[PDB]
Amino acid sequence: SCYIYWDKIKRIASRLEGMNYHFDEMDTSGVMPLLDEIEEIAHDSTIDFESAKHILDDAEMNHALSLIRKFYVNLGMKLQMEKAQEVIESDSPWETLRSFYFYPRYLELLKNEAALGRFRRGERAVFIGGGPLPLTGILLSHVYGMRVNVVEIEPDIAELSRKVIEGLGVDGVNVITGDETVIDGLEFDVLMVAALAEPKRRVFRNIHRYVDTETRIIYRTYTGMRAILYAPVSDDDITGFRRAGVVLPSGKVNNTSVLVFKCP
Amino acid sequence: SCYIYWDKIKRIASRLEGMNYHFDEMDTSGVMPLLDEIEEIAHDSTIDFESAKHILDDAEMNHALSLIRKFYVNLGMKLQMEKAQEVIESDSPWETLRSFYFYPRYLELLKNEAALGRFRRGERAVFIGGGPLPLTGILLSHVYGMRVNVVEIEPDIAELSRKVIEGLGVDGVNVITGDETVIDGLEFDVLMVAALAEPKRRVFRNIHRYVDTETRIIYRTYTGMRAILYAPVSDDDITGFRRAGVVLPSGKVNNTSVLVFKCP
Numbered sequence: 232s233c234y235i236y237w238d239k240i241k242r243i244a245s246r247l248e249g250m251n252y253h254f255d256e257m258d259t260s261g262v263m264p265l266l267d268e269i270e271e272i273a274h275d276s277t278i279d280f281e282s283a284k285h286i287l288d289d290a291e292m293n294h295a296l297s298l299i300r301k302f303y304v305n306l307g308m309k310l311q312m313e314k315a316q317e318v319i320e321s322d323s324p325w326e327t328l329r330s331f332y333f334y335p336r337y338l339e340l341l342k343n344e345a346a347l348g349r350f351r352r353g354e355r356a357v358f359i360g361g362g363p364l365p366l367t368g369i370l371l372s373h374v375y376g377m378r379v380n381v382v383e384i385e386p387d388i389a390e391l392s393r394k395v396i397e398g399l400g401v402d403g404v405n406v407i408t409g410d411e412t413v414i415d416g417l418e419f420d421v422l423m424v425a426a427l428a429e430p431k432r433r434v435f436r437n438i439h440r441y442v443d444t445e446t447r448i449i450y451r452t453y454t455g456m457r458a459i460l461y462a463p464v465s466d467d468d469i470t471g472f473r474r475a476g477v478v479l480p481s482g483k484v485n486n487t488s489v490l491v492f493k494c495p
Numbered sequence: 496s497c498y499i500y501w502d503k504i505k506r507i508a509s510r511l512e513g514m515n516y517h518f519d520e521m522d523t524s525g526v527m528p529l530l531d532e533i534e535e536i537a538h539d540s541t542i543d544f545e546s547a548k549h550i551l552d553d554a555e556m557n558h559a560l561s562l563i564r565k566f567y568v569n570l571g572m573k574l575q576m577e578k579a580q581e582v583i584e585s586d587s588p589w590e591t592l593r594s595f596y597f598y599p600r601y602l603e604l605l606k607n608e609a610a611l612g613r614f615r616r617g618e619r620a621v622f623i624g625g626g627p628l629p630l631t632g633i634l635l636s637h638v639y640g641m642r643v644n645v646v647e648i649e650p651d652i653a654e655l656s657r658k659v660i661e662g663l664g665v666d667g668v669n670v671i672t673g674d675e676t677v678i679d680g681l682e683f684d685v686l687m688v689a690a691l692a693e694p695k696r697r698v699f700r701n702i703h704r705y706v707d708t709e710t711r712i713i714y715r716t717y718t719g720m721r722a723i724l725y726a727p728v729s730d731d732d733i734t735g736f737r738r739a740g741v742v743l744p745s746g747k748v749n750n751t752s753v754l755v756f757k758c759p
């Protein structure tokens with residue numbers, strides 16, 4: 232085979248590689264064009280899922296794919312870091328938060344997930360992998376009226392996220408510093424696994440130990456050409472669970488959301 | 496994992512075990528309820544492709560999958576043979592043809608394919624693997640006004656398919672007895688490969704030698720839970736071609752249709 236996307240992807244990866252050579256520290260404003268070139272490929276609706284695997288998972292794409300995925304992770308993290316601090320400093324913190332590049336996507340994504348998980352006001356939710364900008368946790372309370380624990384493994388990132396929540400005046404959102412294993416000590420009706428929470432295999436094995444067969448578990452993944460952004464959760468990762476629902480994204484939304492329940 | 500469909504599949508397969516190595520001896524009328532049981536699962540739109548893959552790829556499912564596929568291919572062949580002979584003997588051949596159990600699905604399948612392959616009246620189509628009831632060839636002319644050569648490897652089957660075409664009074668449909676390599680001496684705009692055309696490896700490697708990069712090639716395969724019916728075309732099979740489009744079936748249609756082009 233002979234996909235025209237292969238050359239386009241390799242050239243983007245070459246640009247990323249040259250950039251990384253010069254700077255470890257991401258220039259978030261400067262790389263927005265690169266992100267948009269990548270998302271135009273990711274959002275190409277003409278490409279079916281099987282074809283996406285044929286193009287993205289080809290052996291000769293491995294190196295380029297790894298560069299693009301690392302870029303997406305590092306950019307997303309830096310954008311979150313920068314926005315968190317902006318929110319904390321702002322006299323108009325909600326207006327500041329809504330300016331986050333990806334903000335409207337979260338509204339659409341969470342709508343999807345709330346239907347999939349049958350979210351109800353007052354239910355307890357745990358979100359594993361809050362990051363510096365705990366937007367999903369914030370929305371689960373602010374929009375869905377859930378009582379939320381957000382879990383974050385890096386103590387300084389956890390601290391930042393707490394200041395963001397305090398800055399916005401959002402109630403019902405607590406941040407727990409620790410790994411996924413903290414769920415042993417929490418009551419919850421629904422558990423969500425962040426798109427970038429890693430390592431997947433470990434996270435799901437630990438989840439399996441601590442949840443029961445009634446716990447609604449939603450995880451975020453990448454399918455079709457959106458897999459250019461990040462490695463999907465594999466079926467091996469979710470051994471001991473059964474899939475019970477999936478929402479495929481459209482528009483600009485990147486994540487696929489999967490509902491699973493612990494067997495048996 | 497713990498899908499309800501696992502046991503349901505195993506149960507159906509247990510009732511096929513005693514027919515193993517002798518499915519060709521089946522009473523087609525008598526086994527229709529079995530096909531319905533299998534299709535109940537195959538056609539269940541709540542089973543996502545990841546779940547279907549989990550079930551169907553499991554080593555413990557291999558024997559059951561083999562039984563179901565043998566049943567399906569033998570029932571399909573026998574239904575086709577019986578119908579071909581009925582049509583040839585009928586005073587009302589088109590009415591007889593339209594009573595074929597799968598007839599409505601062919602209309603939908605072809606409708607999807609016509610859009611995918613951008614079929615235009617008067618275009619020249621070659622169909623590899625007519626079988627005794629060359630319904631696709633018949634409809635390509637009758638519905639889409641294409642000029643058709645159907646290719647059939649077995650002389651006796653070729654003779655039967657000619658009699659069906661002639662019985663119906665269909666114009667612009669000819670049967671060529673030979674292997675796939677007969678396309679060397681043909682001039683055509685669209686090439687189609689039947690769902691049951693085998694061996695895929697040899698067939699596609701031969702196709703690659705004769706077509707050019709402009710030839711629209713459509714092949715039929717099985718995806719998701721419908722792969723319970725018949726082995727999907729493997730990635731190995733279509734090496735040297737690029738995928739350009741797909742139609743995934745809905746309702747009762749079994750086949751996925753794939754548009755490919757020879758590289759580059």
Ligand SMILES: N[C@@H](CCN[C@@H](CCC(=O)O)C(=O)O)C(=O)O
Pocket residue numbers: 307333336337340360361362367424425426427451483484485486487
């Ligand atoms: N931050 C969220 C992920 C939210 N994804 C959104 C925003 C855009 C993106 O992440 O590429 C989406 O899918 O469109 C998490 O940690 O799960």
Ligand SMILES: N[C@@H](CCN[C@@H](CCC(=O)O)C(=O)O)C(=O)O
Pocket residue numbers: 571597600601604624631688689690691692715747748749750751
């Ligand atoms: N006979 C055709 C296949 C026609 N498939 C139809 C009929 C049902 C079936 O084959 O199970 C379909 O997908 O619904 C061929 O060999 O290409």
Ligand SMILES: [Br-]
Pocket residue numbers: 322323324325326327
């Ligand atoms: Br504000």
Ligand SMILES: [Br-]
Pocket residue numbers: 361362364365366367368
């Ligand atoms: Br988040």
Ligand SMILES: [Br-]
Pocket residue numbers: 473497498499500
């Ligand atoms: Br199930």
Ligand SMILES: [Br-]
Pocket residue numbers: 510529
């Ligand atoms: Br039975």
Ligand SMILES: [Br-]
Pocket residue numbers: 515516517518519565
């Ligand atoms: Br057999």
Ligand SMILES: [Br-]
Pocket residue numbers: 625628629630631632689
């Ligand atoms: Br046919």
